[PDB]
Amino acid sequence: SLSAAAQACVKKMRDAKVNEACIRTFIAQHVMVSKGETYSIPDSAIMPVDSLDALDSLTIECDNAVLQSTVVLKLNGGLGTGMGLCDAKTLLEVKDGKTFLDFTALQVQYLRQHCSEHLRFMLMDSFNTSASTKSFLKARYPWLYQVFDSEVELMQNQVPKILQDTLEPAAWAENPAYEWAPPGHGDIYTALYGSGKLQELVEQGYRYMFVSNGDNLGATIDKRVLAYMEKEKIDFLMEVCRRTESDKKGGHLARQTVYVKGKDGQPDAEKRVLLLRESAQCPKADMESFQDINKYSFFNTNNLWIRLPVLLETMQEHGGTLPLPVIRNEKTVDSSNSASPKVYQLETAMGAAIAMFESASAIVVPRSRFAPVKTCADLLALRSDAYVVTDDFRLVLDDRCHGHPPVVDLDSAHYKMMNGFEKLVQHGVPSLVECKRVTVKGLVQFGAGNVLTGTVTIENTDSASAFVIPDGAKLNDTTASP
Ligand SMILES: O=c1ccn([C@@H]2O[C@H](COP(=O)(O)OP(=O)(O)O[C@H]3O[C@H](CO)[C@@H](O)[C@H](O)[C@H]3O)[C@@H](O)[C@H]2O)c(=O)[nH]1
């Protein structure tokens, strides 16, 4: 019943000893691509979401039994290629000579000292990040390195890149490792299931997992969310933020409607079903609607809560898989070689699981739980005094910002790559806590101890020489130029 290409993929994955849960999931995605539909989510197929509960209005806290059954997992499998990064993004220095991983470890240390003595912590790594992460922890956090292989690390899968023309697995003799890729952070569910770790966690009495992006250092356990899921009997919960103009990269919440006749005497009830639309899933034609922050104002933080026994149950009863919608990425087998074979890379997003559970929901959270670093512009804000370190080692906005992050717009021609960004701040990172918006155009270099207030634009029209701001300069609601 399977196509010759699909069977070629099975053989390649079996010969490579890929676990069967990954194979089953990949082949189901391969079939669907071979048929035709590419899981595009057009505008006519969805509606905006209107009403959601808000974390800031909740007050009930869960008891310590619920809290002790919660696992924390941080995603760490991607690379920061967009920022000119060839390793795990979590090894970037973010503040005071400390990296994302430093603060992650310190947060876990704090929760074990003051809240949950035996907190279970996991990191999802990939083939591209595991070595660096392990070497980093051995030298700085021995207590994590001691149990890294056995308890902390969740290794995600590698799946074959498939040729566009035939859908067979690609061949790249120069470097066969480039014939494989991690299939997105949606792979967390397949990796947990296929490795037996999901079953193991449920056996050990864990009932909730809190997952968040490795680059988001504002995400920690909140006992008001756990009480909410207990009271409302929620099995999957997505934290969303009110969307700003700085939220370009990820995905937004949306809804559909399904009519259920619902037994006899009682009438049919309209039912809302929630879904996630990633940028990669929107047709380029309808991209004007995807970026409309008024129509779709709820932005996925990727702070996710999952009821582990339910996850395990629906995966078992669905062929040992979670059938998430696939994202068909288009690339060359070697990215640095635009002449190499053209391929599709099948991926999924873990937020898409909001559509897999009958009792799924979303909650609006404040910006204090969402400090993403997708660009060097984000890294500039994070490194500045606009962000502070809490007692439990989170990075949150300084109270003076009032939950509005400073809007940082840096010239992509000069500051998209890390090396260009390090030039911009060679002599010091300006004060931004009082700055509503800063725009940098052309080649610029901040001075030592600058202070930006209000709406600042630094502009250099020639871009041969760097406009170097004088040390101590203080700019208030103005454009600065040569
Ligand atoms: O195969 C992969 C790919 C990514 N990651 C990790 O997943 C996290 C998120 O990846 P990133 O590429 O930084 O984000 P996006 O997938 O573009 O967007 C995610 O995060 C956004 C919020 O920042 C949400 O809006 C999107 O819905 C959600 O999919 C990072 O820690 C990555 O390292 C993995 O572990 N494995």
For the chain, the structural domain boundaries read 1-373, 374-482
d(CA 313, CA 311): 5
Experimental technique behind these coordinates: X-ray
H/E element, 262: none
CA 441–ligand 1 middle distance (angstroms): 28
Residue 377 CB partners (closer than 8 Å, separation 6+) = 408, 409, 410, 415
d(CA 89, CA 215): 7
d(CA 44, CA 361): 22
For 365, the token pair is 């959270």
For 371, the token pair is 């400090």
d(CA 29, CA 13): 14
Q: What are phi and psi of 316, to 5 degrees?
A: -60, -40
Q: Which amino acid is at 192?
A: L
Atom of ligand 1 nearest to the CA of 301: 22
In contact, 363 and 305? CB cutoff 8 Å: no
H/E element, 379: helix 376-383
Catalytic annotation present for 374: yes
Strands 120-125 and 153-155: parallel
Distances in whole angstroms, Cα of residue 142 to Cα of each of 134, 147, 198? 10, 9, 25
d(CA 361, CA 355): 9
CB contact burial 317-356 (16+ within 10 A = b; e otherwise): eeeebbbbbbbbeeebbbeeeeebbebbbbbbbbbbbbbb
Distances in whole angstroms, Cα of residue 379 to Cα of each of 215, 342, 372, 429? 10, 33, 9, 11
Q: Is 264 exposed, middle or buried (0-12, 13-18, 19+ CB in 10 A)?
A: exposed
CA-nearest residue, atom 26 of ligand 1? 250
In contact, 183 and 162? CB cutoff 8 Å: no
Phi/psi region, residue 463 (left: phi>0; alpha: psi -120 to 50; beta: rest), is left
d(CA 422, CA 58): 42
Three-state secondary structure call for residue 111:
helix
d(CA 141, CA 337): 38
Q: Which of 12, 74, 95, 374 is catalytic?
A: 374
Distances in whole angstroms, Cα of residue 63 to Cα of each of 67, 116, 230, 360? 7, 12, 11, 22
For 270, the token pair is 């309209």
Is the torsion defined by CA of 367, 373, 377, 380 positive or negative?
positive
In sequence order, the β-bridge partners of residue 452 are: 475
Q: What are phi and psi of 390, to 5 degrees?
A: -80, 175
Q: What is the resolution of this structure in A?
A: 2.0
Beta carbon of 349 within 6 Å of any ligand 1 atom: yes
Beta carbon of 290 within 6 Å of any ligand 1 atom: no
In contact, 53 and 363? CB cutoff 8 Å: yes
Three-state secondary structure call for residue 182:
coil
For 445, the token pair is 């270099």
Architecture of domain 374-482: 3 Solenoid (2.160)
For 4, the token pair is 């010759």
Q: Is 266 exposed, middle or buried (0-12, 13-18, 19+ CB in 10 A)?
A: exposed
Q: What are phi and psi of 137, to 5 degrees?
A: -75, -30
Rg (CA), the chain: 23
Q: Is 403 exposed, middle or buried (0-12, 13-18, 19+ CB in 10 A)?
A: exposed
CA-nearest residue, atom 22 of ligand 1? 301
d(CA 472, CA 98): 26
Is residue 303 a known part of a binding site? no
Distances in whole angstroms, Cα of residue 449 to Cα of each of 103, 395, 401, 473? 25, 22, 19, 7
Residue 334 CB partners (closer than 8 Å, separation 6+) = 172, 174, 175, 178, 340
CA-nearest residue, atom 33 of ligand 1? 78
Interior CA angle at 229 toward 223 and 230, to 5°? 90
In contact, 274 and 48? CB cutoff 8 Å: no
For 434, the token pair is 């009082």
d(CA 25, CA 37): 17
CA 213–ligand 1 middle distance (angstroms): 6
H/E element, 128: none
Three-state secondary structure call for residue 60:
coil
Distances in whole angstroms, Cα of residue 282 to Cα of each of 41, 50, 257, 423? 5, 21, 19, 36
For 366, the token pair is 């404040």
Task: Fold for 1-373, please state it.
Answer: Spore Coat Polysaccharide Biosynthesis Protein SpsA; Chain A (3.90.550)
Start-to-end CA distance of the chain, whole Å, equals: 69
Residue 215 CB partners (closer than 8 Å, separation 6+) = 89, 90, 100, 372, 373, 374
CA-nearest residue, atom 35 of ligand 1? 77
Evaluate whether 1-373 and 374-482 have a shared fold.
Answer: no
d(CA 277, CA 396): 27
Residue 48 CB partners (closer than 8 Å, separation 6+) = 254, 255, 295, 296, 297
d(CA 39, CA 441): 38
Is the torsion defined by CA of 374, 380, 385, 386 positive or negative?
negative
Three-state secondary structure call for residue 79:
strand
d(CA 75, CA 384): 24
CA 193–ligand 1 middle distance (angstroms): 20
Q: Where are the alpha helices (DSSP H) in 16-165?
A: 20-35, 64-68, 100-114, 130-140, 142-145
